[PDB]
Write a protein that binds this DNA or RNA. Structure first.
Ligand code: MG
Ligand code: MG
Ligand code: MG
Ligand code: MG
Ligand code: MG
Ligand code: MG
Ligand code: MG
Ligand code: MG
Ligand code: MG
Ligand code: MG
Ligand code: MG
Ligand code: MG
Ligand code: MG
Ligand code: MG
Ligand code: MG
Ligand code: MG
Lengths: 345, 130, 19, 244, 216
RNA sequence: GAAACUGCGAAUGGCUCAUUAAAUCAGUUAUCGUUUAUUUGAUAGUUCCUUUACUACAUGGUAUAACUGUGGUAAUUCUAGA
RNA sequence: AUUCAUAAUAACUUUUCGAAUCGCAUGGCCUUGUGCUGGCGAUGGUUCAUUCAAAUUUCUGCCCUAUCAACUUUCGAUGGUAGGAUAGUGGCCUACCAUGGUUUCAACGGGUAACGGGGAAUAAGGGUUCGAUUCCGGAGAGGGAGCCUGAGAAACGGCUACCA
């Protein structure tokens, strides 16, 4: 408990608890670099994966599912013409929650969306609802493999429908609130990662609408979920940050400092800053630092006098002082605050 | 040209793989290297070369044909989990463990059997004695 | 009671050529 | 010897396993379990030499440790677990359910069954007695001790056991005209209806059996297993229907 | 003969070499467990009391309690005895052992200070050796620190500091026989299982009785 | 995770044919004449019963190894005292 | 086929057993208490049955020898009864009793370069010879004798004495 399995034994096979698998699991399909069957296609992604799964999986449910839909997926026009029946069967069989057949069905659902992206939008609401019920169902029978399949299916859909979902990112977030706010820590954590991919793909203008909505929700566990969402979006690789991180922080910082936003939002930004401060090295934080200082200088006002202080206190404290580049800037800043509050802060 | 055909294909979800008999027809050639066959079965089944293993190739008398066994795992991780260590070493997926010959290990085992406990007390006792 | 019906093989042979 | 043996030579192993004589020097010794050594099929032989799912002993061990194999609804991890007659072997991953029934040749056959049929098994009542506190019980051929049995159940009758609960759902009396499966001797694997039971006090009882093809044969009562009423067996039978 | 003297209160011990034979004679004819006065041994031991604990002869064979002879004998030693460690379970070995009667043919005699004399020996009384390990069971810790029942042993576990290079950390033992929620859960589960088994047996008996009532 | 305690195994395996002439052994019987580690299946609510002057939210050394330290012997898979 | 299975009454015991053990995980009730309750496994434990086994045991079957014709019985040979011992039947041993048991259908004694069998060779058939030797079973660990441990050993790559 106190110490994780940092030192590995010489054994080739080792027992791993369900919780242990979940902690290591991370939803980011693009990170995986194993060959994907759907990369090679003759007719459509669905058929390519559908043929493969027929030959690997032998479960009772999947075999029955294949028989119904085998005749209607031979050609892409056939899939498009029969899209309605295919989706209903996929949802119907996923509802059975049979672990022996979830993996092919869930994979095909994602690839189904791949074949007809814009036309899958009318199916978008029902697909997410079915996954949410499955994941909520997944809690009672412990299988880390099921969670990986379900969220990877969710991540794939976002990848294929990235353009359309981004335009209405708040709507996609609204569906996943029960997951992001769920009692279990890891369900919110996983759902945050899947939605984080959309966030980093969001235009700045659309992002400002998205951040306003989520902060408006803040005023159970939604606070923790959002913290994972934003920090995951900013973090890209060890000791480094995503290129969009600077744009996200500026959008986040502006909304938090705005008087309309609740104080809880500023606390989130404080928590978001602390996480990225450790994850990133000195160099990757320089662009992020500059936007904070400029925005603080530009938006310093009596109404937001406290809030700029609360964030600034987080900056000086984070990892002690090692991550802050050049400190005259804070001294120049703190002079401005006193020139323009809460004594305790 | 050179042809490969897989027959008697059995899906084995127990070990999470596909096991089959590989027949390679190679007119006007001595024989075909295992690495090429791994590459090409990998391309065929749309899986990683690391997930494909082949063994037991015997050229038919008179040449021109070879027959053996082949395995294609559902994922490279599954192959690393279930494959024999020596086959993993052949394909480079695993590193050969360096160990002393059997006689040396057995002699060391007997010598360690003769000594009881850690033995540092014996060491200090003999150091004092001499 | 009748016995379970045999299942047609899921996998089939497959071929290529090179060189 | 000064104790129980722990090795088995391949030539000494039961013939009906059909073990190659040149593969090695030893054969799997069945561990202690429900079925006797000579009338059992260890899981290693079944998984390797019959289904061919595993190519060597280590692969069978790996399969078992994954907990993919269930015997009579219970997970078994012993490579040499002695599965035997009327045993249900379930492999969920392959969606396969097997019942171990000898063929006309006299060997265990790979007989696939449905889930509904796999939900139960049949047991020959080897003994009926009162236990402690005056609780009646029946001991079957597979070593199952079942308490509170039906009073009508006697020795040599057949009880239908539900695997999930291990209780008696129904039973079939030993009587003339009942359908019977031979589990011993040279007539092993044949199926026929009883005609007469010759009773010799202090000796082995003999049962005359008549096949569908009008042939008759006599077998010791110990090799008899009642499986249902004529033309209406309670279990799916293998190909050939125990003829010849 | 050499004397291996030990002061158990301080945990100290040291050897003394002997030349004059009169003190050795005072050691002669005594037996293991008996007491001798230090003054008869020598002036440096004036006022002390030494208990004889064991020793070894010129040939290295040790002395054994329970054998009353001045000469070596071959005894069949078994499990749980001095001068023998069985290699295999049930093994008994016939080994030479010296008798328990002190004599001139002894190489070293081991002595324990029952009581301290007027003068203080340089290497035994003045020096101390701390205990290697501390208590591990919860009750042992309570006895060691005299804790009340309301007090929790968790706060009074002895911790040893270990410094590796510039790194430095504390290590403490794992308490055995501690009362934790898991033990309570196990006890409760066992009791519930017994109750459930009894109930199921009663239901089965009632069902059988009803079936017999139907048949009769 | 070395060492040590504990549990299991070491009574299997392999080799040879000295002894053995109703003995072993082959076939065939019995245990209503007895033991059986292990596997498999079942199997155990006893409410109460005066010092309740009461541990079960869990008892002792009636105790030791490994370990620290002092030693004997020419010598061993030897060992003594604390 | 039973003094069987099982049950009941009265006492008995240097007298046992009836979980003071461990891993993973943190669900449900509320009177909000580090309160009550609770999941999946591991390891143990009394008795019965099953399985791997073990010990005895019923009937028939072994090469040469009658220039081995009577043998066994004092120091158990045959049987009875009672006890002891044994896991247990039993002259297995002890006490007292009777005088029994085998044999020309070959007892007893002697030889065996005698472990037995599945098998091997030859032969047209009858037979004759070989079988330490891939499997099964018995015995032994230089020769005798006795033992601890353990479910299981008269163990020998365990122990103790004697002989060489
Ligand atoms: Mg009988
Ligand atoms: Mg031990
Ligand atoms: Mg003779
Ligand atoms: Mg005989
Ligand atoms: Mg065992
Ligand atoms: Mg001590
Ligand atoms: Mg008697
Ligand atoms: Mg007598
Ligand atoms: Mg001989
Ligand atoms: Mg022979
Ligand atoms: Mg042999
Ligand atoms: Mg022997
Ligand atoms: Mg020799
Ligand atoms: Mg011996
Ligand atoms: Mg030797
Ligand atoms: Mg040996």
């Amino acid at each position: 408990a106190k110490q994780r399995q940092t030192t590995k034994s010489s054994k080739r096979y080792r027992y791993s608890s369900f919780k242990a698998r979940i902690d290591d699991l991370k939803i980011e399909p693009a990170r995986n670099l194993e060959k994907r069957v759907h990369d090679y296609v003759e007719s459509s992604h669905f058929l390519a994966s559908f043929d493969q799964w027929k030959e690997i999986n032998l479960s009772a449910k999947f075999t029955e599912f294949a028989a119904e839909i085998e005749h209607d997926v031979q050609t892409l026009p056939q899939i498009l013409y029969h899209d309605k029946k295919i989706f209903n069967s996929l949802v119907s069989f996923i509802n059975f929650h049979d672990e022996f057949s979830l993996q092919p069905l869930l994979d095909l659902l994602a690839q189904f969306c791949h074949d007809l992206g814009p036309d899958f939008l009318k199916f978008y609401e029902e697909a997410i609802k079915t996954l949410i019920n499955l994941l909520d169902a997944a809690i009672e029978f412990e299988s880390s493999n099921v969670f990986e399949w379900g969220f990877n299916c969710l991540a794939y859909i976002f990848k294929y429908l990235s353009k359309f979902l981004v335009k209405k990112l708040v709507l996609t977030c609204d569906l996943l609130i029960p997951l992001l706010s769920h009692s279990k820590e890891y369900l919110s954590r996983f759902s945050a990662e899947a939605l984080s991919f959309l966030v980093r793909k969001c235009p700045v203008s659309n992002l400002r609408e998205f951040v306003r909505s989520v902060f408006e929700k803040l005023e159970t566990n939604l606070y923790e979920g959002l913290l994972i969402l934003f920090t995951e979006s900013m973090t890209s690789t060890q000791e480094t940050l995503h290129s969009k991180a600077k744009a996200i922080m500026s959008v986040l910082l502006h909304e938090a400092l705005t008087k309309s936003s609740p104080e809880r939002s500023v606390s989130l930004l404080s928590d978001i800053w602390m996480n990225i401060s450790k994850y990133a090295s000195i160099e990757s934080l320089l662009p992020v630092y500059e936007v904070m200082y400029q925005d603080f200088n530009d938006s310093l006002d009596a109404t937001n006098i406290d809030r700029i202080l609360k964030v600034l206190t987080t900056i000086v404290f984070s990892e002690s002082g090692r991550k802050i580049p050049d400190w005259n800037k804070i001294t120049i800043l703190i002079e401005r605050i006193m020139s323009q509050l809460s004594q305790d802060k | 040209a050179v042809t490969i055909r897989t027959r008697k294909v059995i899906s084995n979800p127990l070990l999470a793989r596909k096991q089959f008999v590989v027949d390679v027809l190679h007119p006007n050639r001595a024989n075909v290297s295992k690495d090429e066959l791994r590459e090409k079965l990998a391309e065929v089944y749309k899986a990683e070369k690391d997930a494909v293993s082949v063994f037991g190739f015997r050229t038919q008398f008179g040449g021109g044909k070879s027959v053996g066994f082949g395995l294609v795992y559902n994922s490279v991780a599954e192959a690393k989990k279930f494959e024999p260590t020596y086959r993993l070493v052949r394909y480079g997926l695993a590193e050969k463990v360096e160990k002393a010959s059997r006689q040396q290990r057995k002699q060391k085992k007997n010598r360690d059997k003769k000594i009881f406990g850690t033995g540092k007390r014996l060491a200090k006792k003999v150091a004092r004695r001499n | 009671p009748r016995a379970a019906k045999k299942r047609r093989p899921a996998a089939k042979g497959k071929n290529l050529s090179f060189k | 010897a000064r104790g129980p043996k722990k090795h088995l030579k391949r030539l000494a192993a039961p013939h009906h396993w059909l073990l190659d004589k040149l593969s090695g020097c030893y054969a799997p010794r069945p561990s202690a379990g429900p079925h006797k050594l000579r009338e059992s099929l260890p899981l290693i032989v079944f998984l390797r030499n019959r289904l061919k799912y595993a190519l060597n002993g280590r692969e069978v061990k790996a399969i078992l440790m994954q907990r993919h194999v269930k015997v009579d609804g219970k997970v078994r991890t012993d490579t040499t677990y002695p599965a035997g007659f009327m045993d249900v072997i379930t492999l969920d991953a392959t969606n396969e359910n097997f019942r171990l029934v000898y063929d006309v040749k006299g060997r265990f056959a790979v007989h696939r069954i449905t889930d509904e049929e796999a939900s139960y098994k049949l047991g020959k009542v080897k003994k009926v007695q009162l236990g402690k506190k005056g609780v009646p019980y029946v001991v079957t051929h597979d070593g199952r001790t079942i308490r509170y049995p039906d009073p009508n159940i006697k020795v040599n009758d057949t009880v239908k056991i539900d695997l999930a609960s291990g209780k008696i759902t129904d039973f079939i009396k030993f009587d003339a005209g009942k359908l019977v499966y031979v589990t011993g001797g040279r007539n092993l694997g044949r199926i026929g209806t009883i005609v007469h039971k010759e009773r010799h006090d202090g000796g082995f009882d003999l049962v005359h059996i008549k096949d569908s093809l009008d042939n008759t044969f006599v077998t010791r009562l110990n090799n008899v297993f009642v499986i249902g009423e004529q033309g209406k067996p309670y279990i799916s039978l293998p190909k050939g229907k125990g003829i010849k | 003969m050499k004397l291996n003297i030990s002061y158990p209160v301080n945990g100290s011990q040291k050897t003394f070499e002997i030349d004059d034979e009169h003190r050795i004679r005072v050691f002669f004819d005594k037996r293991i467990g008996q007491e001798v006065d230090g003054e008869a041994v020598g002036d440096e031991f004036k006022g002390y009391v030494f208990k004889i604990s064991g020793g070894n002869d010129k040939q290295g064979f040790p002395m054994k309690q329970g054998v009353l002879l001045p000469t070596r004998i071959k005894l069949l030693l078994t499990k749980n005895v001095s001068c023998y460690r069985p290699r295999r379970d049930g093994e008994r070995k016939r080994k030479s052992v010296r008798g328990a009667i002190v004599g001139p043919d002894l190489a070293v005699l081991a002595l324990v200070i029952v009581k301290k004399g007027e003068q203080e020996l340089e290497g035994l009384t003045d020096t101390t050796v701390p205990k290697r390990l501390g208590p591990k069971r919860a009750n042992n810790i309570r006895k060691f620190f005299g804790l009340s029942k309301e007090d929790d042993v968790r706060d009074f576990v002895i911790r040893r500091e270990v410094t590796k290079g510039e790194k430095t950390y504390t290590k403490a033992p794992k308490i055995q026989r501690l009362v934790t929620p898991q033990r309570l859960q196990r006890k409760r589960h066992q009791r519930a299982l017994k109750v459930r088994n009894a109930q199921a047996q009663r239901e089965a008996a009632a069902e059988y009785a009803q079936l017999l009532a139907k048949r009769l």
